[PDB]
Amino acid sequence: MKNATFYLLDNDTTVDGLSAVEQLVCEIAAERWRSGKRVLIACEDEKQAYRLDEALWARPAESFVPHNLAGEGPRGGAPVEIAWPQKRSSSRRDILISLRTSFADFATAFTEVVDFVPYEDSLKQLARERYKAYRVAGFNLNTATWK
């Protein structure tokens, strides 16, 4: 089945230059990796990718999450790969954590996808559009809060 999960944020607090969403990405990527998954984080831009590449060495706290930007790391890519539109990713990945503002076609190749519904009202419509798009692409949809 394809499974897409939309985490609903309850704030838009920025910390160390990281949006509320990017902070949650670090938590999710670590938990999925630790559960034995190969993770792809699809960033909307190169700059966002460098922001998360750095953020993942500091958070979650007391963790060592092996990761690299799309074209770096070990052969086949690091367990957690961080890419951007202008940069092809490593194959053989179990879960997609997408920071793309609009539905990305490469998402359909995954069985598990994680997307978000930002707090700021001005971004909720884009999120709604994405939701409908996953529905059209055949994904089984569900929303959740992270804890």
């Binding site: 630790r34 060495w57 963790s63 060592f64 092996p66 790391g73 052969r75 690091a78 367990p79």
Partner: protein, 110 residues
């Protein structure tokens, strides 16, 4: 050198440090997972004892807070003491970088 400390048959990683942490430590556990090494495949030894291993031993190792390289054949990863690794994000990225340089020893292709 009559008596020596032998590396068990199932061990694939020798962890060396002045203070041997608990393999279930949050940070230690993540590093082991990064190395695709299960805790059960780890032999923890203080710097002393490495000199007691039989001449010709071959096993990968990870040493913490011990600059002097081990006299143990194998891929050798080195990082600051656990205390310092846990608080230095830069140190952690460097450890990973060091691990990647040895991908052929820890993540053999097949």
């Amino acid at each position: 050198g009559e008596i020596a400390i032998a590396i068990p048959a199932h061990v694939r990683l020798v962890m060396v440090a002045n203070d041997l942490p608990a393999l279930t430590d949050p940070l230690v556990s993540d590093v082991l997972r990064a190395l695709t090494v299960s805790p059960d495949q780890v032999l923890q030894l203080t710097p002393e004892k490495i000199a007691m291993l039989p001449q010709g031993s071959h096993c990968n190792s990870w040493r913490l807070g011990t600059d002097e390289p081990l006299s143990l054949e194998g891929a050798q990863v080195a990082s600051p003491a656990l205390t310092d690794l846990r608080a230095n994000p830069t140190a952690r990225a460097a450890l990973w970088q060091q691990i990647c340089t040895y991908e052929h020893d820890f993540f053999p292709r097949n």
